[PDB]
Tab-separated table of C-alpha atoms and ligand atoms in Angstrom:
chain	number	residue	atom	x	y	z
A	1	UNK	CA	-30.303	67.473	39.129
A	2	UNK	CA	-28.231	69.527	41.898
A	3	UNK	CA	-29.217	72.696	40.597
A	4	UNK	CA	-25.842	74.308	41.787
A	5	UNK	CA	-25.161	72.594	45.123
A	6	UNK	CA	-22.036	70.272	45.573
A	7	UNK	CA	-22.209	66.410	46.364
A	8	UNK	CA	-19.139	64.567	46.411
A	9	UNK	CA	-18.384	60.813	45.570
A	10	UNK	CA	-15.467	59.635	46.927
A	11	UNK	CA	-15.014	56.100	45.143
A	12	UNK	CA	-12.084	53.562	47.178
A	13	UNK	CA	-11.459	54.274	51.049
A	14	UNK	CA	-7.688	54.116	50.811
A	15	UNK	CA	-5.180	56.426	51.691
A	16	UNK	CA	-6.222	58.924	49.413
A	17	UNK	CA	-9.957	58.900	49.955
A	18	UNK	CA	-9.871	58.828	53.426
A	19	UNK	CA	-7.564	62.044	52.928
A	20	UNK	CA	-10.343	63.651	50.827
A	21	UNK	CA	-13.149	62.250	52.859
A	22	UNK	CA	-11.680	64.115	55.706
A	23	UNK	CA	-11.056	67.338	53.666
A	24	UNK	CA	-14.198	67.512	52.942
A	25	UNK	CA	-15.989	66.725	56.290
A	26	UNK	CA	-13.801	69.555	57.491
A	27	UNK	CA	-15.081	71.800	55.138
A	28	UNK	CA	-18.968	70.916	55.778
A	29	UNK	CA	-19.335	69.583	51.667
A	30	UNK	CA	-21.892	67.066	51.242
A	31	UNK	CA	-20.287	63.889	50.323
A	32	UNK	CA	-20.783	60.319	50.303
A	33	UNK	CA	-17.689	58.238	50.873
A	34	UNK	CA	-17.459	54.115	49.289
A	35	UNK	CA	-15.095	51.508	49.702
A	36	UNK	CA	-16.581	47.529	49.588
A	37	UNK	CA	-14.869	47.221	52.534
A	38	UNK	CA	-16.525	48.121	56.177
A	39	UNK	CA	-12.455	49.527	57.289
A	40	UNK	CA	-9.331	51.308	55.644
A	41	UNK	CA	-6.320	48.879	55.604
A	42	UNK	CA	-2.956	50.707	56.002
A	43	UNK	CA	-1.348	48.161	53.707
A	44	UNK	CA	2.085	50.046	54.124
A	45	UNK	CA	1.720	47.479	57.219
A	46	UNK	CA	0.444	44.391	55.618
A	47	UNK	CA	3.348	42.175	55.812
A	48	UNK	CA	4.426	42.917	59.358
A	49	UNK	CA	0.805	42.276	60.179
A	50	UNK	CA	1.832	39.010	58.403
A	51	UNK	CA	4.286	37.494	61.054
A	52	UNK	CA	3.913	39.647	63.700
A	53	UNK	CA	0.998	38.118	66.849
A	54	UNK	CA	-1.371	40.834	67.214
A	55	UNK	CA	-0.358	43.461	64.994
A	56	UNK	CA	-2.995	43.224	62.469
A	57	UNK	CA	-5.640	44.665	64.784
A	58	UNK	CA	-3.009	47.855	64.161
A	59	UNK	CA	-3.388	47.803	60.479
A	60	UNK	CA	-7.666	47.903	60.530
A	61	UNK	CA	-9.597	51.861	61.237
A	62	UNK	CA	-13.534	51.493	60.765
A	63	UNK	CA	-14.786	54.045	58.602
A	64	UNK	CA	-18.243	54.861	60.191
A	65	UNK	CA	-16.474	55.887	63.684
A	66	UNK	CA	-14.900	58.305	61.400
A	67	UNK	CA	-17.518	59.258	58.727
A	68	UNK	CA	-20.480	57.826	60.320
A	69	UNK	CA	-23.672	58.580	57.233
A	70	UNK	CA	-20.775	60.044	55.330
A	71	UNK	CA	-19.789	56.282	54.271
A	72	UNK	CA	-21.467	53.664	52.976
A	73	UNK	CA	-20.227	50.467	52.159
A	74	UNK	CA	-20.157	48.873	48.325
A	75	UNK	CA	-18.992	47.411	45.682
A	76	UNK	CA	-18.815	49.969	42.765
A	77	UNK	CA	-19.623	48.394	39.294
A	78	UNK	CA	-20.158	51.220	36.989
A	79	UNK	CA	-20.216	54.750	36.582
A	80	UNK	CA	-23.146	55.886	34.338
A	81	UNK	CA	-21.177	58.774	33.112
A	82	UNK	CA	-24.688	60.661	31.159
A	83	UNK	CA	-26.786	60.996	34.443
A	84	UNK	CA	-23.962	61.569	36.767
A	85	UNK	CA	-24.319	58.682	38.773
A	86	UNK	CA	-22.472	55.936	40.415
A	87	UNK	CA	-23.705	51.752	40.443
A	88	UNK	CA	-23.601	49.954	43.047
A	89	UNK	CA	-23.895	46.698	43.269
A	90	UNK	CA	-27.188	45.682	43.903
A	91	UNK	CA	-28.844	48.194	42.329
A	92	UNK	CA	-28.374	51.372	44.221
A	93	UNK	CA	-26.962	54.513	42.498
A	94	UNK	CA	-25.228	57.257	44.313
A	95	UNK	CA	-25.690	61.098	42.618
A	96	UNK	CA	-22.653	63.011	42.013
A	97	UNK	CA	-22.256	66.917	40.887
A	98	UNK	CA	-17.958	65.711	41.576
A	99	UNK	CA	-16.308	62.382	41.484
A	100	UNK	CA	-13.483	61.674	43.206
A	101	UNK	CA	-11.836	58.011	41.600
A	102	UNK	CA	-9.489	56.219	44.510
A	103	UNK	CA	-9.678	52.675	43.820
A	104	UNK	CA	-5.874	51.786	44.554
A	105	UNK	CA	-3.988	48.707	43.553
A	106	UNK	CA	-5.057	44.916	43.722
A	107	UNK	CA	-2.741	41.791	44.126
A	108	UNK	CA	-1.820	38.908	46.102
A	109	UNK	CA	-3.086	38.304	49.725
A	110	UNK	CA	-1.539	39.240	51.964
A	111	UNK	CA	0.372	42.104	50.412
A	112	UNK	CA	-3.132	43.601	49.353
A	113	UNK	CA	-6.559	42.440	50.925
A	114	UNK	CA	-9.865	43.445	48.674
A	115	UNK	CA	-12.155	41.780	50.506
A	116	UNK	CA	-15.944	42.566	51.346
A	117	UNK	CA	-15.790	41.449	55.413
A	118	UNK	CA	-16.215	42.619	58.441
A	119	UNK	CA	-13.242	44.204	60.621
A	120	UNK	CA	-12.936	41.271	62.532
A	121	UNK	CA	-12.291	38.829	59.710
A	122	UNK	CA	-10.127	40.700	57.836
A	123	UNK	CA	-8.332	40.642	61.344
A	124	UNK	CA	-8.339	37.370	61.680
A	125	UNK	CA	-7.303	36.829	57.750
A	126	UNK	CA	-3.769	38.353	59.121
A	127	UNK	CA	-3.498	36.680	62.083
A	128	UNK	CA	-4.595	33.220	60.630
A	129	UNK	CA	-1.562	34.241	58.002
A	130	UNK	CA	0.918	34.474	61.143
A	131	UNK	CA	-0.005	30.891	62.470
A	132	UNK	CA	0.562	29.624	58.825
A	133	UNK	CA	4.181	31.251	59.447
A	134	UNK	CA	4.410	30.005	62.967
A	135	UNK	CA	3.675	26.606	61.478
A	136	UNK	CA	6.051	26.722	58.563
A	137	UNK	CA	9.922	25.670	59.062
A	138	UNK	CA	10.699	26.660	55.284
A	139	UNK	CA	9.248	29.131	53.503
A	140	UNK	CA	9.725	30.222	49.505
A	141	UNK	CA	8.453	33.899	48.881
A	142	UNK	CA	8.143	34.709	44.917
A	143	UNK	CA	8.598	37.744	43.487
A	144	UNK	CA	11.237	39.782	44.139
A	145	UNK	CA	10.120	42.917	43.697
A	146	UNK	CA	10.052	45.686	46.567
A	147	UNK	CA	7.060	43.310	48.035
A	148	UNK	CA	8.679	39.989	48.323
A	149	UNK	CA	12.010	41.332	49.574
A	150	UNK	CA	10.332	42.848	52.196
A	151	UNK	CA	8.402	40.208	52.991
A	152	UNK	CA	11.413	37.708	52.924
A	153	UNK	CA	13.175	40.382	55.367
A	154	UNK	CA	10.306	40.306	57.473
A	155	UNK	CA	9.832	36.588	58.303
A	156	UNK	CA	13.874	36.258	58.967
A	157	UNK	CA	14.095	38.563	61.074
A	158	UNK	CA	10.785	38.098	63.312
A	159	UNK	CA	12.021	33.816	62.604
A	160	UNK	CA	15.514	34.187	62.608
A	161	UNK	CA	15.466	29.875	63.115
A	162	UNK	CA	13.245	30.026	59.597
A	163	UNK	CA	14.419	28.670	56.056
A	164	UNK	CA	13.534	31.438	53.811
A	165	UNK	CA	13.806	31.076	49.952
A	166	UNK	CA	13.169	34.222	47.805
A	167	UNK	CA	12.411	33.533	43.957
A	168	UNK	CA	12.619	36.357	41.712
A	169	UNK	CA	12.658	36.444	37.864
A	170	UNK	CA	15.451	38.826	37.370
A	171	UNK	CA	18.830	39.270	38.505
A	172	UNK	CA	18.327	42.554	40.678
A	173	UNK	CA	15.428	43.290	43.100
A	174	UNK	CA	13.036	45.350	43.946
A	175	UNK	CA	11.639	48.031	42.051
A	176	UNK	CA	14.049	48.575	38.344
A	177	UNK	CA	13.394	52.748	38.950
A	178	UNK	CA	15.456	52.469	42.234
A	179	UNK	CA	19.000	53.935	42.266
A	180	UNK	CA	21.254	50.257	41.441
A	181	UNK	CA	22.871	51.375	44.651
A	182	UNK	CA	19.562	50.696	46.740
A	183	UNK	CA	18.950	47.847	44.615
A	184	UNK	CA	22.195	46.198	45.296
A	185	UNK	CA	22.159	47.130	49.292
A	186	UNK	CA	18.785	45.072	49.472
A	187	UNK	CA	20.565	42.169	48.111
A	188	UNK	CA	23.301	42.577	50.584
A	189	UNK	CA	20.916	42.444	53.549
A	190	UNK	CA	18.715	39.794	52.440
A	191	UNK	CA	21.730	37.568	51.831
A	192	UNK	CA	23.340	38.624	55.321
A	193	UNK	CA	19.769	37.755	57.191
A	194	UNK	CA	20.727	34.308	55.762
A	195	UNK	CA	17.451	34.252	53.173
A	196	UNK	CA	18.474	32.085	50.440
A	197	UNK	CA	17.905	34.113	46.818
A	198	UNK	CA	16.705	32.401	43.939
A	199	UNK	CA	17.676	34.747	40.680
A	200	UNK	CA	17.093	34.710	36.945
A	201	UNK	CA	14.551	31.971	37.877
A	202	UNK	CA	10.705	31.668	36.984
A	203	UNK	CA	8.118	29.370	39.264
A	204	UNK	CA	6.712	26.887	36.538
A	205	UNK	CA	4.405	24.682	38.739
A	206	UNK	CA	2.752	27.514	40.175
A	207	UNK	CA	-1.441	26.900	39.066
A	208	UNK	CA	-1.080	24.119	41.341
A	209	UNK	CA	0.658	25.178	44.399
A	210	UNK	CA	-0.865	25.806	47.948
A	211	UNK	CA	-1.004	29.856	48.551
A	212	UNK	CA	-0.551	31.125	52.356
A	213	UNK	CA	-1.076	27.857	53.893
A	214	UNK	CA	0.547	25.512	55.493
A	215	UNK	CA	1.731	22.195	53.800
A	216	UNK	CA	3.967	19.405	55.395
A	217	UNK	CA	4.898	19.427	51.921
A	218	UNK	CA	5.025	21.038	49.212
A	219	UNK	CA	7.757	21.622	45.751
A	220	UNK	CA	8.014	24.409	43.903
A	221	UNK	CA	9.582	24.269	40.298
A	222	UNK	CA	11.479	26.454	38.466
A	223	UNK	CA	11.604	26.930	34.691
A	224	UNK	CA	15.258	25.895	34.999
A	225	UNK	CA	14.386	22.719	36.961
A	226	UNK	CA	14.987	24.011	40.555
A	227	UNK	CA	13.080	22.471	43.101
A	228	UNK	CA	12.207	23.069	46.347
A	229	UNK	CA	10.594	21.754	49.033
A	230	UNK	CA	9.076	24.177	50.954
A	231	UNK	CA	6.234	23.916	54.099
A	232	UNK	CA	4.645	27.558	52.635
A	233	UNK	CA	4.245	29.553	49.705
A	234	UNK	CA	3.879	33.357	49.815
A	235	UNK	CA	3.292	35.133	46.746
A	236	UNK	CA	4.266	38.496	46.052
A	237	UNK	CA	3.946	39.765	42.431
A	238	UNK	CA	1.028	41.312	40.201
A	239	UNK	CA	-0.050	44.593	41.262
A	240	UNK	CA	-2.137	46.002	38.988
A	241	UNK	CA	-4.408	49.257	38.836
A	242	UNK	CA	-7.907	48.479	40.465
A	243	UNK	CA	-10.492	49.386	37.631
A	244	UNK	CA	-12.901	47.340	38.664
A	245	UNK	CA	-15.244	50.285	38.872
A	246	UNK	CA	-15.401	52.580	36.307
A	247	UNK	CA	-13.556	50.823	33.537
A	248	UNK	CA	-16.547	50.224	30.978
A	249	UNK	CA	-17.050	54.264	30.894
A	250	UNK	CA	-14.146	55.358	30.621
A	251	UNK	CA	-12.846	53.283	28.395
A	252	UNK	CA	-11.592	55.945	25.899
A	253	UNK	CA	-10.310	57.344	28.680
A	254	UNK	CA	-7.940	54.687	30.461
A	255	UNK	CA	-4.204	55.038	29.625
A	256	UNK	CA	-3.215	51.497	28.867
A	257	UNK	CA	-2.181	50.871	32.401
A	258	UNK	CA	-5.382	50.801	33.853
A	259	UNK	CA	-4.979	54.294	35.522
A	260	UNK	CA	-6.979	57.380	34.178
A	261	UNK	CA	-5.078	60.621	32.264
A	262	UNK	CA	-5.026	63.691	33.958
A	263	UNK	CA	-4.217	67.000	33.716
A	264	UNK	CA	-1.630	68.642	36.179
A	265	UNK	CA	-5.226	69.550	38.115
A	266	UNK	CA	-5.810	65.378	38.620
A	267	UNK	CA	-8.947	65.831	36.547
A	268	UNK	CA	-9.947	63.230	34.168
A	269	UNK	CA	-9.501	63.931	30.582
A	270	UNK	CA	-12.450	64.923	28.986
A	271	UNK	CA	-14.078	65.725	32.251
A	272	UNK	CA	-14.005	68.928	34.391
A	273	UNK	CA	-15.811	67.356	37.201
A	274	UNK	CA	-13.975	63.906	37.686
A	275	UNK	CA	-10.885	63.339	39.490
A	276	UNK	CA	-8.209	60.690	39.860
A	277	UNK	CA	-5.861	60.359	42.944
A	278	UNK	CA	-3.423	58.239	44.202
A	279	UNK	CA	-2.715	54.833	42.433
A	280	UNK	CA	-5.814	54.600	39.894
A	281	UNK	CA	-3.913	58.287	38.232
A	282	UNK	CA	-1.654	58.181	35.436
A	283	UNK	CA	0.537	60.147	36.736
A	284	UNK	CA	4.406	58.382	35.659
A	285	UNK	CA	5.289	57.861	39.237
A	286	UNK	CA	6.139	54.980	41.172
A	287	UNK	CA	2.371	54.538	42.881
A	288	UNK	CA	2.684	55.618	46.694
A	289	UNK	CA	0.320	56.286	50.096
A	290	UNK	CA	2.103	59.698	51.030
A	291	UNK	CA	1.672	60.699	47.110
A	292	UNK	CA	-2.016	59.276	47.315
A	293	UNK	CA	-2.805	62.164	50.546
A	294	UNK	CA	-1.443	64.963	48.420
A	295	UNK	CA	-3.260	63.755	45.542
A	296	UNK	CA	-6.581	64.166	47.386
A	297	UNK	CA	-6.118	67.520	48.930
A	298	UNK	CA	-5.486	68.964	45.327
A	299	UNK	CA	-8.390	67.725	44.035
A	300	UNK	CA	-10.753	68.626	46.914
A	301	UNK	CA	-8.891	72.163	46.726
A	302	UNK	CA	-9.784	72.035	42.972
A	303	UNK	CA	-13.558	71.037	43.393
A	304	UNK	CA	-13.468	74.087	45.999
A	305	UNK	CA	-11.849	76.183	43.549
A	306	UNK	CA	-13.598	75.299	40.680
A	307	UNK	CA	-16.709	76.334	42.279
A	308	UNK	CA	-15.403	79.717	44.199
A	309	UNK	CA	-13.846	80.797	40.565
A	310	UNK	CA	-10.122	80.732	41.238
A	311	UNK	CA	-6.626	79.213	39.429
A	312	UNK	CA	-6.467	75.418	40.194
A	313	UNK	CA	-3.902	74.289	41.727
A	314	UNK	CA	-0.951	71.659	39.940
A	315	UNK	CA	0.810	68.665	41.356
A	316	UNK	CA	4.712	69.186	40.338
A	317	UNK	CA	6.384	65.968	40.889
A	318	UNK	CA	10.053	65.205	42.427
A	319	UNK	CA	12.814	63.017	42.266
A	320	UNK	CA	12.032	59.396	43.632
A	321	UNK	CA	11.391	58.690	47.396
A	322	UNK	CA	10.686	54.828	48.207
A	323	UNK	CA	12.068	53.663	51.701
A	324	UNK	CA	12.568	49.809	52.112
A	325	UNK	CA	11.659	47.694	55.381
A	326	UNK	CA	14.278	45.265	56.198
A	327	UNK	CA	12.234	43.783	58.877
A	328	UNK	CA	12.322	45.628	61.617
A	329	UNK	CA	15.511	46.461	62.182
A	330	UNK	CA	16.829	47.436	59.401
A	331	UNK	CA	15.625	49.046	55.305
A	332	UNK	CA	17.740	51.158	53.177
A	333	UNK	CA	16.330	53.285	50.302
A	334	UNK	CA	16.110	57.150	48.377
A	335	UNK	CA	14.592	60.435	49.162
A	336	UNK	CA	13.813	62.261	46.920
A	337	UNK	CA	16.520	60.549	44.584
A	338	UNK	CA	19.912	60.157	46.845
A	339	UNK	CA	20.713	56.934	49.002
A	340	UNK	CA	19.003	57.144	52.254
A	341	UNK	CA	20.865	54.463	54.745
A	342	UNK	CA	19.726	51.494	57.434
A	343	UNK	CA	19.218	54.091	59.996
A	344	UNK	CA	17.664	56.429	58.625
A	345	UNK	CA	15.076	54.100	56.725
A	346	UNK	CA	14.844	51.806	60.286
A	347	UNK	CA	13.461	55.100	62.280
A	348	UNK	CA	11.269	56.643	59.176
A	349	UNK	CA	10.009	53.227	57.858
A	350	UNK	CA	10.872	50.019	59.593
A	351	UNK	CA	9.858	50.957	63.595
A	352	UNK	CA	6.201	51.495	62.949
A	353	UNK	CA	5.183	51.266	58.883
A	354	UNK	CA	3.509	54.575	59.376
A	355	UNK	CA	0.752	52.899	61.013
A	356	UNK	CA	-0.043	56.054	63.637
A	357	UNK	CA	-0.205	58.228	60.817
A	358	UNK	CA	-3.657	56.544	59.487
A	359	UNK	CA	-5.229	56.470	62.905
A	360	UNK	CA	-4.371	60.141	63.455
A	361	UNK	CA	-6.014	61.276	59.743
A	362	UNK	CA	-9.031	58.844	60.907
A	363	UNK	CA	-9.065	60.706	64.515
A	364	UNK	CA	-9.011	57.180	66.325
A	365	UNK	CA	-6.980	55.211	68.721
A	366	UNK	CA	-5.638	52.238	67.966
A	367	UNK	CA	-6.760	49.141	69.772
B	401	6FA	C1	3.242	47.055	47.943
B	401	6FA	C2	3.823	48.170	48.770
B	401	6FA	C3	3.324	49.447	48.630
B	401	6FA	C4	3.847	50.509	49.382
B	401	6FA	C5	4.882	50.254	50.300
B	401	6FA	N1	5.433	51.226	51.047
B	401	6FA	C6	4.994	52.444	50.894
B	401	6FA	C7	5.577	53.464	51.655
B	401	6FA	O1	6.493	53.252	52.434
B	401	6FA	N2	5.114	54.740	51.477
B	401	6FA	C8	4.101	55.027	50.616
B	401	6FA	O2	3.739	56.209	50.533
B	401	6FA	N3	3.513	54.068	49.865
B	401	6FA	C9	3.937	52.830	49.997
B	401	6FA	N4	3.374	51.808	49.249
B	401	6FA	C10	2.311	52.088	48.268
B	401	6FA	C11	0.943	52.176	48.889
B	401	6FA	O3	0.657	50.957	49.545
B	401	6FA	C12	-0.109	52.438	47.811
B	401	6FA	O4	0.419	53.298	46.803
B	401	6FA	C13	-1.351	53.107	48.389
B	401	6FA	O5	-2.043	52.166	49.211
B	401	6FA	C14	-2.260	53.651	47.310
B	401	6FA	O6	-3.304	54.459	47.920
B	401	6FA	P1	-4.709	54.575	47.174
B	401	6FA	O7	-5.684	55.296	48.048
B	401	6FA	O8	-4.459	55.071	45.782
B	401	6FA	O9	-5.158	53.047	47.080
B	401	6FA	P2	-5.536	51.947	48.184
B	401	6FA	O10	-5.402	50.608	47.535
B	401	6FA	O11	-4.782	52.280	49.422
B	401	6FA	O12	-7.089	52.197	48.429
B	401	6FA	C15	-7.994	51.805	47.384
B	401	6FA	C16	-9.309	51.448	48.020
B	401	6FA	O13	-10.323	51.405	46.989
B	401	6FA	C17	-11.250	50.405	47.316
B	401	6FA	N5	-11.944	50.061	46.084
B	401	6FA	C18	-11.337	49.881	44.869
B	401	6FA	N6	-12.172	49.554	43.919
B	401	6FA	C19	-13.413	49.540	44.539
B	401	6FA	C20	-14.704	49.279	44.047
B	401	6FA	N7	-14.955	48.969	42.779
B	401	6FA	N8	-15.733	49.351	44.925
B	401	6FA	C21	-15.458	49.663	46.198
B	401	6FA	N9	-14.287	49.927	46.775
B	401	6FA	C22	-13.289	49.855	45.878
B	401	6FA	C23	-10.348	49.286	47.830
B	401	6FA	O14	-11.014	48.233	48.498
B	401	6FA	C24	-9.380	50.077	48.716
B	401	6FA	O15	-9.998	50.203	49.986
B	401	6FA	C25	5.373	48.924	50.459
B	401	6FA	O16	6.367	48.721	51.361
B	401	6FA	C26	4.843	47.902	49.698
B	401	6FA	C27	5.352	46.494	49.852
């Protein structure tokens, strides 16, 4: 019963809902801000903080330095859609008059990490990821898709004295929407780093192999009878939408992907009060962190909006921008659809991930 006054649910403490979370702290709206995890994970940074010794600590913001009694961590189960409400688990609901849904993508450690923990041991889940590496002379990374080959990239050229095998399904890599002229220049560089690329072939043993640790031995098998031998195994495929929390209410709702329909306002179809940002949106692009920030301050402009009487605001999307790290050193990729070269993508991406960029929206230093 709010009886006109606003309270705000931000559900998923990712790049988009720490982007509303701080819209709305600016503004002085009442808001409560969840995520099951006690810190936002700049994920953009994941795989560096993968192979590179004490970069992970980079890649971890605590939320209650930022938000303080604005956050509160939880796992979200359900949304009880008829009283406005939001389950957590455990028991506790959290009253809404606007919902804002965030929830990102899930997949493979250590490309994603959805893990209730503290700061420190999701820390030390990266850097315990790095010794595996530092133990491993050969190492097989499957999937190519635009997380694998940057993963691959990453070890060889951090290891350089590394065996790296890449196994990937199809014949080109990374993601299909990319112009073939990206796709082919990431096979170039992956081949010139001297990682050895497995095409057209499909891991067939894979229920049974050792993930992200460290083996004296282990073979992997291929559906066409490849093996090899391999001291690691890295895997890097299945993203998928992370409906964890609201799917059984929205049911009708869910396009088949997992993400929510929306209007050109991000609001939830059949809902005037409900927003979608970021990944968990239906929104026919290709799912990124810089898209995710816009996302949110449309739909905390539209909650203000909507309440001060006024024309909502639309998102208008562009052609395709998707930059890829080649390590360090090097990346290729498009803005806004053209070819974007190795410089350019080595000082925009490959340098620093982005990583300041999350510590300045969270107002905090990096340790
Ligand atoms: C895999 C990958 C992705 C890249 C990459 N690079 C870029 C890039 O360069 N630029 C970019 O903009 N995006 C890039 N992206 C995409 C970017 O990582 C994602 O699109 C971005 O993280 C999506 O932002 P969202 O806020 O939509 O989603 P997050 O996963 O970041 O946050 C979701 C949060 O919700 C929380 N959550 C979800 N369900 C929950 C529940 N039921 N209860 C509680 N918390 C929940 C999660 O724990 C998590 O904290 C990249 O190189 C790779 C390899």
């Amino acid at each position: 019963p709010h009886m006109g006054a606003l309270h705000v649910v931000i559900v998923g403490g990712g790049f988009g809902g720490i982007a509303a979370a701080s819209q709305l702290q600016a503004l002085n709206v009442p808001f409560m801000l969840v995520d099951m995890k006690d810190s936002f994970h700049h994920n953009v940074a994941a795989l560096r903080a993968s192979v590179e010794t004490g970069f992970a600590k980079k890649t971890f913001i605590s939320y209650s330095v930022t938000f303080k009694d604005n956050f509160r961590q939880g796992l979200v189960v359900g949304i009880d859609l008829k009283n406005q409400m939001v389950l957590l688990q455990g028991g506790e609901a959290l009253p809404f008059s606007h919902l804002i849904l965030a929830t990102g993508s899930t997949g493979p450690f250590p490309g994603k990490f959805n893990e209730v923990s503290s700061q420190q041991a999701a820390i030390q889940a990266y850097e315990d990821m790095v010794r595996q590496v530092q133990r491993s002379r050969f190492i097989v990374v499957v999937g190519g898709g635009s997380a694998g080959v940057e993963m691959a990239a990453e070890i060889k050229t951090e290891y350089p004295e590394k065996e790296v095998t890449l196994i990937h399904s199809q014949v080109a890599l990374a993601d299909k929407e990319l112009l073939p002229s990206v796709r082919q220049e990431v096979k170039e560089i992956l081949l010139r780093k001297g990682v050895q690329l497995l095409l057209s072939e499909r891991v067939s043993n894979l229920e049974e192999l050792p993930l992200n640790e460290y083996r004296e031995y282990i073979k992997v098998q291929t559906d066409k009878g490849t093996e090899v031998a391999t001291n690691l195994v890295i895997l890097c495929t299945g993203i998928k939408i992370n409906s964890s929390a609201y799917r059984k209410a929205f049911e009708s709702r869910l396009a088949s992907s997992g993400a929510l329909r929306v209007n050109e306002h991000l609001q939830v179809e059949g809902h005037s009060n409900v927003y979608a940002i970021g990944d968990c949106a239906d929104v026919r692009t290709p799912k990124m962190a810089y898209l995710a920030g816009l996302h949110a301050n449309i739909a905390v402009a539209n909650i203000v909006n909507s309440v001060k009487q006024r024309p909502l605001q639309a998102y208008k999307p562009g052609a395709l921008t998707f930059l890829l790290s080649m390590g360090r050193n090097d990346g290729v990729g498009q803005i806004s659809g053209f070819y974007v070269g190795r410089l350019m993508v080595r000082l925009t991406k490959s340098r620093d991930l982005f990583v300041s960029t999350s510590w300045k929206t969270m107002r905090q230093s990096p340790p």
